[PDB]
Design a protein around this nucleic acid. Structure first.
Lengths: 93, 148, 203, 181, 96
RNA sequence: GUUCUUUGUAAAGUGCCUUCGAAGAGUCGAGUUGUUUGGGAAUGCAGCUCUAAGUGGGUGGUAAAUUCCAUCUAAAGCUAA
RNA sequence: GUUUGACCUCAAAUCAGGUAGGAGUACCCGCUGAACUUAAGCAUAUCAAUAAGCGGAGGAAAAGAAACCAACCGGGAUUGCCUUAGUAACGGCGAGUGAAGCGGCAAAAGCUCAAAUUUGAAAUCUGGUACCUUCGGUGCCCGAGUUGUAAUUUGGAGAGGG
């Protein structure tokens, strides 16, 4: 292996959130109404950074509901799976 | 003299009708080192006297060159106690004078011409020509006899 | 002002005028004693910026200190242990010669408090410092609130404890990632982090 | 597998039996300070500031003191503020208008809520509050609304990040090429 | 100016801007008229040091490269050697 | 609270323009030796030698050269919890 | 004038008035500095930047208002706790050793000199002495001091002129 002088584990902070959960970040009160109302003109925006998540992954299926995901990093398959349902991924910093 | 000036000032100004007309414009010598070095670089000084004997000579080594550069007539006087006498101190290490009465203007100008001709025009070369190659009398006799 | 000229001129140490003055003054100081009262500073600008004030209760002592490395005073240079110690004439004495001079001067003048010190000259054998001291029993300094702090008893033998500037430097007291082992006290940090903290409800 | 007990650790052992008594003395010190400080809070108003260190920049957080620009914009001076009960930090600088306006409104609210007594006299009784931190709590700003219209353009953020990475990686080479031109 | 993403040449979230003020502990060491005058006069008095006297000979004989080398050795660093040699070049071009 | 004294037309705060804006040297820094540190082409200290600058100087955890950027302002000092 | 004085430097007094020493040393600031032990025996190493030894203070000491951390949408004196972390890193890469920024918290407090001509007035200060309303005040007299005592200014700024 190689070395790293003055390593500090804040450059590397990048927790991950698979697509399977992705609605735990929506409260329960709001979840079932947004599920039934598959409205493309009005979809729930999900801020993953405020929840404490850097990157989004695509381990599993979500329904075909639109959703606006705000994240710093994503995977190709995650973007694909969200776009299938008809959700955009807005990038943040 | 300061005390009598102050009581006269209080008597004339506090009760009477004037602000600073009681005590007139004073003329005197300037004697502080920093004050005189600041008078130079504003070119208010007409004459400067610099004591030859100072402990830290580095206090005064720069002063002749500075007076030359700013165009001031300087002189090097024998005695800092001699300056302390005329300024009510034990030592002064400098003395300056920047203004005079008209009765003494001509004497001051003649004195400055005298100082220039006798001091600077005579010793303008002294920035070269090192000193202090003297020997004791025994060594001098040795050198003389070995020479002849 | 002339103090500026004095500063810029004292910075030019290898010029002819200053090496002449050095050659004279070192001889004078070597004919005088090792510690002796100076009537006035050789360097008024340096003393002025270090805290000297030309009034009663401010004192200047010229002091002489031998140069070189530290020798351990074991008999016949034998240490009676493992050989890895080192050659004996190669030890360095973490405290500086300025601190040594300050402490000797404060031992001679114990009624005074050592405010500061500064280099004046040196030779192959000796270094020369001027030490600035203060009289806290003098009323002009017990008053005059800019210097009445030296009269409190926590400023006794500042030089011996390492509170002068040379002491702070030799202890390595500054801010940064470089002074991490010695920032609040080397031994303090060592005692702090070689310490087993155990709470009531164990973590 | 690594237990650091080869030194004389048994000399340097601190056990915190003094936990409860220290808590009690801390409370008593707070009470005594309150009595000595009676009409005033025991806490200076601190500003809002955004934390550094990407792990934490999402959060807003309480700082040391307000800037001189913030104080002048509010319309009072640093010394009078320090007497009034406001913390001031001369070395913090303002590069964000959001934080600037937030702390300005903080100072405005504080000025409106307080009541200053004259130096000469009266000193009407005021029923102290103990916590300016509780009276003026920190507010996390609101990024966006709960729900919004979707808008897709087809640049796939994955590819966007890859292109950003690539231009960062191959900046210098292209610059040296255009130099050799 | 920022981009609004977590990577790239200018990464980070976009805030509006402020240019707060120019601090006065940024123009430290800048040359004042008094410093210029004092230092010129002190140079006129004290003159040259021995390694400077060597440098003025070696720039005339040997070129600036030997001067830069020996000045890097007599001083600490190349950054200071450059400025010292520039100073000596200006002294030479003035007196000559 | 109740008087004693109004000290003072004496000090302090504030707006705009204009000219300035001094800021610590055998010190910083570099070489070598010893010691120390987690500090690794060398973390801090001390000894010997060398020794600066002012749009400058220090730091930016891989040694140098070149172009930039960011952040502080040393070599003087006091201070409760 | 081979006289009479001024200054500088160095001394002396049972001169007037004060001051240091020594003890204690649980904690605190430095200096100096081992070996037993553990590593196979052992020079590196570890025990340990420990014990013994020396100097020096206080009720706390030290540190302290950045020649800081950072690379963020930037934080913002120091100290201590939780955590960072038995991690980055060091090491016959073996025995073993080993921090720091961030974050939450306790407590919160900011400031001072030198470098600037008062120059239409050394405006400053110790002591002696007589009174007083005595942790001090007023007057008066020797003195310190211009080789710089006061006011004004400390980089966050600030000064001068208007």
């Amino acid at each position: 292996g190689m070395r790293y002088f003055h390593k500090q584990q804040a450059h590397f902070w990048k927790p991950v959130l698979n697509l399977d959960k992705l609605w735990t970040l929506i409260p329960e009160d709001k979840r079932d109404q947004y599920l039934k109302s598959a409205s493309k003109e009005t979809a729930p925006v999900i801020d993953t950074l405020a929840a404490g998540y850097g990157k989004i992954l695509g381990k599993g299926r979500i329904p075909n509901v639109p959703v606006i995901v705000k994240a710093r990093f994503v995977s190709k398959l995650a973007e694909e799976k969200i776009r299938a349902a008809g959700g955009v991924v807005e990038l943040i910093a | 003299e300061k005390k009598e000036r102050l009581t006269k000032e209080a008597a004339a100004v506090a009760e009477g009708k004037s602000k600073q007309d009681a005590s007139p414009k004073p003329y005197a010598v300037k004697y502080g080192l920093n004050h005189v070095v600041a008078l130079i670089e504003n070119k208010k000084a007409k004459l400067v006297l610099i004591a030859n004997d100072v402990d830290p000579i580095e206090l005064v080594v720069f002063l002749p060159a500075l007076c030359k550069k700013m165009g001031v007539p300087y002189a090097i006087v024998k005695g800092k106690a001699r300056l302390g006498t005329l300024v009510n101190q034990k030592t002064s290490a400098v003395a300056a004078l920047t203004e005079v009465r008209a009765e003494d203007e001509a004497a001051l100008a003649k004195l400055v011409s005298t100082i220039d001709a006798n001091f600077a025009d005579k010793y303008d070369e002294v920035k070269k020509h090192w000193g202090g190659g003297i020997l004791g009398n025994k060594a001098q006799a040795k050198m003389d006899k070995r020479a002849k | 002002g002339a103090y500026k000229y004095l500063e810029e001129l004292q910075r030019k140490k290898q010029s002819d005028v200053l090496r002449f003055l050095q050659r004279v003054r070192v001889w004078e100081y070597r004919q005088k004693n090792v510690i002796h009262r100076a009537a006035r500073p050789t360097r008024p600008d340096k003393a002025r910026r270090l805290g000297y004030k030309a009034k009663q209760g401010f004192v200047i002592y010229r002091v002489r200190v031998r140069r070189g490395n530290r020798k351990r005073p074991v008999p016949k240079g034998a240490t009676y242990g493992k050989p890895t110690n080192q050659g004996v004439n190669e030890l360095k004495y973490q405290r500086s010669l300025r601190a040594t001079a300050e402490e000797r001067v404060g031992r001679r003048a114990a009624n005074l408090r050592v405010l500061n010190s500064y280099w004046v000259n040196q030779d192959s054998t000796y270094k020369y410092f001027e030490v600035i001291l203060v009289d806290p029993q003098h009323k002009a300094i017990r008053r005059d609130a800019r210097y009445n702090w030296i009269c409190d008893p926590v400023h006794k033998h500042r030089e011996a404890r390492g509170l002068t500037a040379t002491g702070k430097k030799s202890r390595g007291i500054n801010k940064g990632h470089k002074f991490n082992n010695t920032k609040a006290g080397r031994r303090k940090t060592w005692k702090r982090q070689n310490t087993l903290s155990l709470w009531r409800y164990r973590k | 597998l690594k237990n650091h007990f080869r030194k004389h650790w048994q000399e340097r052992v601190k056990v915190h039996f003094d936990q409860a008594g220290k808590k009690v003395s801390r409370r008593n010190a707070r009470a005594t300070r309150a009595a000595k400080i009676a009409p005033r809070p025991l806490d200076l108003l601190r500003p809002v500031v955004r934390a550094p260190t990407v792990k934490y920049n999402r959060k807003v957080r309480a700082g040391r003191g307000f800037t001189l620009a913030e104080v002048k914009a509010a319309g009072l001076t640093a010394a009078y503020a320090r007497t009034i009960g406001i913390a001031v930090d001369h070395r913090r600088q303002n590069r964000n208008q959001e934080i600037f306006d937030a702390n300005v409104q903080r100072l405005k609210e504080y000025q409106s809520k307080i009541i200053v007594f004259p130096r000469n006299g009266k000193a009407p009784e005021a029923e102290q509050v103990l916590s300016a931190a509780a009276t003026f709590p920190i507010a996390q700003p609101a990024t966006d609304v709960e729900a919004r219209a979707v808008q897709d353009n087809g640049e796939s953020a994955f590819r966007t990040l890859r292109l950003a990475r690539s231009e960062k990686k191959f900046r210098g080479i292209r610059e040296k090429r255009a130099r050799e031109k | 100016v920022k981009t609004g993403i977590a990577i790239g040449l200018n990464k980070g979230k976009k805030v509006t801007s402020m240019t707060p003020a120019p601090k006065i502990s940024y123009k430290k060491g800048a040359a004042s008229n008094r410093t210029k005058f004092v230092r010129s006069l002190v140079r006129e008095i004290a003159g040259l040091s021995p390694y400077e006297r060597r440098l003025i000979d070696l720039i005339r004989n040997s070129g600036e490269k030997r001067a830069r080398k020996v000045a890097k050795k007599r001083l600490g660093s190349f950054t200071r050697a450059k400025a010292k040699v520039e100073e000596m070049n200006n002294i030479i071009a003035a007196s000559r």
